[PDB]
Ligand binder design. Structure first.
Ligand code: CL
Length: 426
């Protein structure tokens, strides 16, 4: 598939550009047909693993249809405006304008910086720039910013040949930052992101640095900031969070300490399952349960290497991003006995509960419907799985809605931060 989709894309991009029949030559600078690109933007399969390489595609005319797809699919939670394909000193530059609505996503003025609050009255621009190699950046960046804390810059980087440790790429990027610092600031760039594509099907890496001192935002290291909501970080707001980096980049583990009570330590792992290919043979239900399983294995191994000293209510959050043909009952099926298979490992590790998020193609409407399975180890006697949908309530906030008989969180708002151990308060 990684081959097939890598090719599948090429045809879709160039087919968006091409406007004319054989022999007559096509227009030098022409807009791409969004009806034709739409089926690549609104796709349930992964796209970002295979797409970045086409931003430094040879031709500058698909490069721009590549850009749009990226922007238009990263900013699925935003109200996107219009996009201009500019032309820099060297490589092209793409500018999109955008703004965020008030129920954009499950846990509700920006997605990645939850402290960016604005009134009922706010103006937000973004740059996309492709580069070929990290050395290219410094020259490109300053000129690029000129098309002018509220803006956003995403920089793609087609190669890092001649680099070894991340950490040496990190302080390269820090150099590049601290040399353009005041110039980034003048473009009111709130958050800039370097995104390194790949070819064998690995998911891009992401580095993001914020604010006036462009220090790295560790908490959203390998996720496009626009989609960081898939991590649902807001729900950790009663804890001082800190990442623990891992070799699996679909996995974001965080040490949490209740601000209120330094003795309430936990680890929240939040894994993400994008999907690029399902096998013909197997059921959907069968697919959900292997990767869930896989992911929980990879997850458990990291905790069984990390120092989980006085942790207690350790928590796992698996997030599927695709849409699936399956049924709520079949979904619930798949996670029957899900943890039990891990009982001794979850026991030794103090993992008390796990939450899965799946989306279901509605049989009739064909529209996507979000489920949560909340599995709770507590009351150790048995494991209860409570199944919800997500619904907008009276107030306008997304909310759990049980599938059967009311559950623990039957109409709680999905954004509810995990409660703290209060009895540990002085
Ligand atoms: Cl993607």
């Amino acid at each position: 598939s990684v081959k097939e989709r890598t090719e599948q894309i090429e045809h879709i991009l160039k087919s968006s550009v091409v406007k004319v029949a054989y022999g007559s030559s096509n227009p030098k600078r022409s807009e791409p047909d969004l009806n034709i690109l739409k089926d690549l933007i609104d796709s349930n399969y992964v796209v970002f693993d295979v797409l970045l390489q086409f931003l430094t595609h040879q031709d500058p005319v698909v490069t721009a249809a590549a850009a749009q797809v990226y922007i238009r699919r990263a900013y699925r939670a935003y109200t996107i405006g219009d996009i201009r394909v500019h032309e820099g000193v060297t490589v092209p530059i793409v500018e999109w304008k955008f703004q965020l609505p008030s129920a954009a996503f499950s846990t509700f003025v920006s997605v990645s910086d939850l402290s960016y609050v604005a009134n009922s009255q706010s103006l937000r621009e973004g740059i996309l720039m492709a580069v070929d190699h990290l050395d290219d950046v410094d020259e490109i960046l300053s000129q690029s910013l000129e098309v002018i804390l509220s803006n956003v810059a995403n920089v793609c980087v087609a190669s890092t040949e001649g680099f070894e440790s991340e950490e040496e790429i990190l302080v390269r990027l820090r150099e590049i930052l601290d040399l353009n610092k005041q110039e980034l600031i003048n473009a009111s760039i709130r958050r800039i992101t370097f995104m390194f594509g790949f070819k064998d099907g690995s998911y891009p890496k992401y580095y993001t640095f914020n604010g006036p001192n462009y220090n790295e935002n560790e908490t959203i290291r390998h996720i496009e900031p626009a989609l960081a909501f898939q991590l649902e970080l807001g729900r950790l707001s009663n804890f001082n969070i800190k990442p623990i980096f891992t070799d699996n980049r679909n996995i974001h583990v965080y040490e949490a300490v209740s601000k209120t009570s330094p003795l309430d330590k936990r680890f929240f792992t939040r894994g993400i399952i994008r999907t690029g290919h399902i096998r013909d043979d197997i059921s959907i239900q069968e697919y959900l349960t292997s990767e869930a399983n896989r992911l929980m294995s990879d997850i458990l191994d990291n905790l069984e290497v990390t120092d989980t000293s006085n942790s207690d209510l350790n928590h796992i959050f698996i997030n599927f991003i695709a849409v699936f043909d399956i049924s709520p009952e079949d979904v619930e099926a798949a996670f029957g006995g899900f943890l039990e298979r891990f009982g001794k490992r979850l026991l030794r590790l103090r993992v008390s509960s796990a939450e899965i998020r799946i989306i279901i193609k509605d049989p009739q409407t064909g529209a996507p419907v979000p489920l949560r399975a909340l599995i709770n180890n507590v009351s150790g006697y048995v494991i209860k799985t409570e199944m919800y949908t997500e619904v907008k309530n009276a107030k306008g906030e997304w909310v759990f809605k049980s599938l059967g008989k009311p559950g623990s969180m039957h109409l709680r708002p999905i954004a509810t931060p995990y409660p703290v151990k209060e009895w540990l308060q002085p």
